[PDB]
Inverse folding.
């Protein structure tokens, strides 16, 4: 099992630059596709950009173009994120996450989802639209709950490239569903996903106390970016 | 104008304790009532507890009772928050905020709202239901928007002690409305408040580009605590 390990907390002055590392270990390869996603206080997950090291291709969200540089060193299986001209709004936990693309003699086969996440790096600075999700859901043990994720024809409604994540507060997210309804190995089939038109959904059946957490949807887009949902807190009564 | 100045960023190990300070300056008359409110990554504002230094009384959220201690040193106009047994979920920006209670020769007059806020202190920890608000509201310039805030008869429905805040990214919250429908001096009268049963509403008329921000309601409670809403993001369209 591949693990992503990030560099430590950074305390920075406004206008300075920061460089965070993400070391991938435990697999057969050293060129995994890595995206950087941040989570600011009072905000949900926000995709910044990503790199495909074997091709040297980097892609960024318009919000970060010219401010963020993502690089990778295949010889040490490490990816990096450099953020310049730091401001108060940049105080956040920054995560690196792998996109589990497959390659063989016939080509490149992307998986537009984040299957493993680093532990996060807090960066604190001195002195398109998100997908809509309900803020909170509650139900009792053994019941089923369905969480909606509303987007547009340029994201959720375009193709089957919607994914879902569980995040316990202060912990890294965990992938539950990718490509609308596929479950990674290790995830219970209690978790299921679907979609209709521009609306995706996650159903958690057989609700357990351990399911109390925040849940996010995400989708790739026609702009070659990712967008995350606003997040839903699940409380088990 | 009174300013609240907090201590610097803290990087702590799990299981340790942290102490954050809040110094008031710019005012003259007395020590002020202070609450501590945190904002963790991916979470809304969360009230922890507060103190009224001149009375020596303090209140704490049930979630934090015993793990948080709030104290004040009137001789240096400083309030403190100590949080013990730190865990990953405690990584957050911690704010101090003033409750502008005051007194005169005849008595004490509380104001259940947070009028001035410190700049925040990040605490990083090593490698009661919130009020219901809609996640998102979107409209074009010039339209009106209305944000609901649903609680219970022990909070929103109990008394006219509901307040509203605007928060831009990278900034502390700003008080817009207190006591359901009162506007502080300086706040545009295009912001107004209402309340019916257990639901309060913020109305913004003549929507402007600068109004794009997150908005939170808060209510005091019958348990002598405060509770915040989940927060609404307002998007101002083309
Ligand atoms: Cl380090
Ligand atoms: Cl390695
Ligand atoms: Cl399983
Ligand atoms: Cl099944
Ligand atoms: Cl420590
Ligand atoms: Cl009135």
């Amino acid at each position: 099992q591949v693990q992503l390990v990030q560099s430590g907390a950074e305390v920075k002055k406004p206008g300075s630059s920061v460089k965070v590392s993400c070391k991938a270990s435990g697999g057969t390869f050293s060129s995994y596709a890595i995206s950087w996603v941040r989570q600011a206080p009072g905000q949900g997950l926000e995709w910044m950009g990503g790199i495909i090291p074997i091709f040297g291709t980097a892609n960024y969200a318009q919000k970060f173009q010219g401010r963020v540089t993502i690089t990778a060193d295949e010889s040490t299986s490490t990816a990096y994120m450099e953020l310049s001209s730091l401001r108060s709004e940049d105080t956040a936990v920054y995560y690196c996450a792998r996109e589990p693309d497959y390659y063989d003699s016939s080509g490149y086969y992307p998986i537009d989802a984040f299957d493993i996440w680093g532990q996060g790096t807090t960066v604190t600075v001195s002195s398109q639209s998100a997908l809509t999700q309900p803020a909170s859901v509650s139900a009792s043990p053994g019941q089923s709950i369905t969480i909606s994720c509303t987007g547009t024809s340029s994201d959720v409604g375009a193709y089957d490239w919607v994914s879902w994540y569980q995040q316990h507060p202060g912990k890294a997210p965990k992938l539950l569903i990718f490509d609308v309804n596929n479950r990674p190995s290790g995830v219970s089939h209690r978790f299921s996903g679907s979609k209709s038109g521009n609306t995706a959904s996650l159903t958690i059946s057989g609700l357990q106390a351990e399911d109390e957490a925040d849940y996010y949807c995400a989708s790739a887009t026609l702009l070659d970016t990712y967008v995350f949902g606003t997040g839903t807190k699940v409380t088990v009564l």
